[PDB]
Amino acid sequence: TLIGGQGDDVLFGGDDSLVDTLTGLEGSDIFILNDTTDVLNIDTITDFNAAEDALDLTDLLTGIAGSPGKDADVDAVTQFLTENVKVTDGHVKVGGEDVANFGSDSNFDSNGVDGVTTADSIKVIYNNEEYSINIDG
């Protein structure tokens, strides 16, 4: 159980084999997630707020054949992330697998209107740069 504070934190449970519970609290927090092979070992993010927080998914994305390398620009990265990161209300998946379990204080309404729809997006970090990926369904 790894808890931030009211500022802008960076939270990480480790490149481990165990469930951690991650809570960002106020502020715009980055949750760094590890890729596991056992989907039962993935972390819980208790309070992801899509209008503020972000997910660093580099570790889940880098081992996909053809992932963008050191010479990629932000349009190539955007195209890759669009194809590979599936964002829905309460879920984020890579390769059909959940990156994390999102807990009951999460909110995927990034824009503050219409609840959660395809107009909403999440902030995804790949190689220390940030991208907005829309809800796709």
Binding-site residue ranges for Ca(2+): 5, 7, 9, 13, 16, 18, 20, 24-27, 29, 35-36, 43, 52-53, 70, 109, 111, 113, 115, 120
Near Ca ion in 4-43, by CB under 5 A:
4, 9, 13-14, 16, 18, 20, 24-25, 27, 29, 35, 43
DSSP state of 114: S
Rounded least distance, CB 82 to Ca ion, Å = 19
If you search the block for the tokens 């964002």, which residue do you land on?
87
Selection from 88, 97, 84 nearest residue 126 by Cα: 84
Question: What phi and psi values does residue 30 have, to the nearest 5 degrees?
Answer: -100, 125
Per the CB < 8 A criterion, the answer to whether 67 and 80 are in contact is yes
Query: Least distance to Ca ion from the beta carbon of 25, Å?
Result: 4
Answer yes or no whether residue 56 interacts with Ca ion by CB under 5 A. Answer: no
